[model samples]
Target: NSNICEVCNKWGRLFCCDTCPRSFHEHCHIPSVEANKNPWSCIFCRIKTIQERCPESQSGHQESEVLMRQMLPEEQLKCEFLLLKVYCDSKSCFFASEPYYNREGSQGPQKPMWLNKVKTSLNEQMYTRVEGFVQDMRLIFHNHKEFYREDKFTRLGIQVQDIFEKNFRNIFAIQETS
Candidate 1:
């Protein structure tokens, strides 16, 4: 009594897709099982395959033009406070956001509010932004360490890795691990 597609023999959850519904599973305009497959479409939509879709665009400037803002260290004056936000289900960050939870064990919905907000405001994302954050932190830690405050690499390295891990876990939500 089950209506199955001949190619994959998967039960046709979507009745409209008469062809290759079994062979293919669509996830937010992507083929779920499209391994080593180029852009190909299914029987569902008349639109272009995900290959035609643009990469998840984020506008964090990489290697922008350098400017001599601070020529003299003694001349440099105090400025505003720089707030660092680390995201995760825990209350580590002021504005906390729960990680994308998918019971079915896959990448959950792409509702990246905290990340996107930062990206929109600062112009970056997981790929670019996280690295920038880490680099900035490293510089801060390095500066402090260089002046004999504390060694950046050795002192509290776990904490540093913890912040980064949590930050990315919230954004990416990889379920391969615990």
Candidate 2:
């Protein structure tokens, strides 16, 4: 069941989306849903609304190459929004800071990736292409899986991955191949 908050995967009082099965804690959501607002739709639904009004580019290119192209303003905003969403989720706190100082056995991932580092890269415009940003985001999840076994931390990584995939698809309007 989707009883857990889609953003944090924790059980608590949740705000259900009017247009989808996803539920979130009011504060866990991007805009922070109001307690009094009824029939509130989640950000996914709102993305569709905005896209329908002003559609994005339909330019044709290799699916792989498209991501390698320089990041667009819209893409930048979407990435920032996604980072903000991850930051808002309390579960992400564990990965916000560097893991190396406390990790005694190994020195963490060979190339460590964390939420703050990803945010910094995006803010500093270090990512010239969308692929760079995407890789870093994926690396954070990869590191989590590598460092932790099947536990709450790894599960939280999965939760954040789910959130990222859903919003990524909507924000980019990704079409399903199959």
Candidate 3:
């Protein structure tokens, strides 16, 4: 039996990885690992294995290329909103401009007039000349986060519900004036 631990090269009871050829001392393995006898790879081998299995480590960004054609405009935006919601979920904040406070007045951004209008205006082909709507949507999306405001990271899809709710006061004002 080898007296030198493969990890620290010190003499001790070395536990070997079942999948890898490396051994470790009872106390000398990497921080994530336990004792020397676990059925796992050494840190070096584990990293290599994980890298090899990474979905993005294939020939290229294979998923997005196919998704580009398959995803509709709204679906793509929903995906964007989901990521934003996930980030907000982590930070204990609201991705929506108006917080969700139901059970009393008006029930959480449920203005039916605005919802009906937004649903029809989202199609790109039908609204060919209406860049104002697109501009407003972009404004709501681009203005949501103030901290992680990097263009590459923050320019995610805005849910119809979010932008509509954010612009509701303005929407009401515009309708009154017009």
Candidate 4:
């Protein structure tokens, strides 16, 4: 039921969504669920509402143009939001935390990346180019796939990667040519 959080799938004092079966711990949610709110809807439901309210258009081209330019104020917020979304989507904070174990020989990731590192970089304003931020995000998923080749965690990595890409596209209004 609403006993477990949808983000971490852990048992806690969860805030149940009014419109869905999803529940989330206060800090697990991107914006952090407010317990004082009477009728709270999860991010998934809120996104649908926004989508329905504003139908898609050719505005992607305009947004993509800005995306090519230097990082703007709004773009910074979008990047933070994207990272937060990834954090929430990841299973048990697997992608967010540092790997506990290491490979014996030269089989580990050359440049290991994690969500927390990305967040730190973002917070410190270390990324001068937006592409650098995007690269780091992709690196995390790539490293995940490389480390856990054909396991369940690898599949989870793919799922999280897909989520990240989809949100990246939507947030920046980047259109696929396919």
Candidate 5:
């Protein structure tokens, strides 16, 4: 139904977007960005906007620089390790038939095929893809620290084993969906 929430794809009283056909339940938009607000956007569009605002480190961009710096090295390193572990565990699962750098229309991070692709070629596109994942891995940690402890120094340790396992199970879905 047109009134159904876009996020859950469920029937409910929805607040229709001012700029787009999308609509959502109050519970769907994180803060439930008020639909009545003029020129407002939807949750998907907001996340898409952020991802688009930041790419390949977002180092110099004013909008993304602060957001990027919020993630500390430890979180990035830990998240990176978990992401790498997933790829290492199931090399074929990610690379079997997926596009190396052809994520058409996806505003999320660009996912690469494998380490081998980057290693063998070392081209600009390959480097960009890898950098994108690194930034995204950190972004996931920054955005979803609730999945683990809030403490910066404390590692998730064994607690993260299952989390990362579940994380790798279509792990991309974390950032991809959110």
Candidate 6:
């Protein structure tokens, strides 16, 4: 089994650090880290010694900071977002309870209230649960990124999307939902 982190050569149950996607074995000493997660942080850490760094955001703050900004009324972009938890039956449990905040993640932009509606008949409104082994993650955009606002939502959308795709692309070997 491909057990060692390509970046850091260590051996233990293979998992990616939830905070950073660099691959490492659960036991590699990045600092005070969990050998087994109670509130599981990712099980492994990737060596990020040489990865290409992204351009800093225009406002020069981190993604987590961007999310906090949305909470302030003065900084709101009228961005609309919703929380979705898609569970897959046949994959890693972390993936099974697929939670997408702001239709993206912690740093997704603010959305206006009116945009979240899907008109339906008086009796047959349907909502879907995300069930099955998670196969992938995405940025299912209905319109251009700017159609909402050129803000953190779009940025967070891609950040979560690329992380999911690149990280968990191979974990779903379980039966899935329609």
Highest lDDT model number = 4
Better of 4 and 5 by lDDT: 4
Number of clashes in every candidate structure? 0, 0, 1, 0, 0, 18
Q: For candidate 3, which ten residues in a row score worst on lDDT?
A: 169-178
Report the Cα RMSD per candidate: 17.9, 6.4, 18.9, 4.8, 18.4, 19.4
Query: What's each prediction's TM-score?
Result: 0.22, 0.62, 0.27, 0.64, 0.32, 0.21
Clashing pairs in 4: none
Model 5 Cα displacement at 19 (Å)?
4.0
lDDT of 5 by residue, 92-120 (tens): 23322323322344232333333334223
Q: Write the per-residue lDDT of candidate 3 for residues 37-65, one digit (tens) a residue.
A: 44566554644454466534323323223
The better candidate by TM-score, 1 or 4, is 4
**Model 1 TM-score relative to the real fold:** 0.22
> What residue runs in model 3 are displaced by over 4 Å at the alpha carbon?
1-3, 32-38, 55-178
Q: Report the C-alpha displacement of residue 140, candidate 3, in angstroms.
A: 45
Q: Supply the TM-score for candidate 2.
A: 0.62
* lDDT computed for candidate 4: 0.72
Q: What tens-digit string does per-residue lDDT give for candidate 2 at 39-117?
A: 7877667655656767654323344664776877666666766776677567778778777634545346788888878
Model 2: residues with Cα > 4 Å off, grouped in runs:
1-53, 56-66, 101-107, 150-152
Residue 162 accuracy (lDDT) in model 1 = 60
lDDT, each prediction: 0.30, 0.71, 0.39, 0.72, 0.41, 0.29
Give the alpha carbon lDDT tens digit for every residue of 56-160 in model 1: 312222222111223121111000001122321133232223334333323433333332233233322222233443344334323322333333433443454
| Arranged by lDDT, best first | 4, 2, 5, 3, 1, 6
TM-score for candidate 3, residues paired by index = 0.27
lDDT at position 178, candidate 3: 18
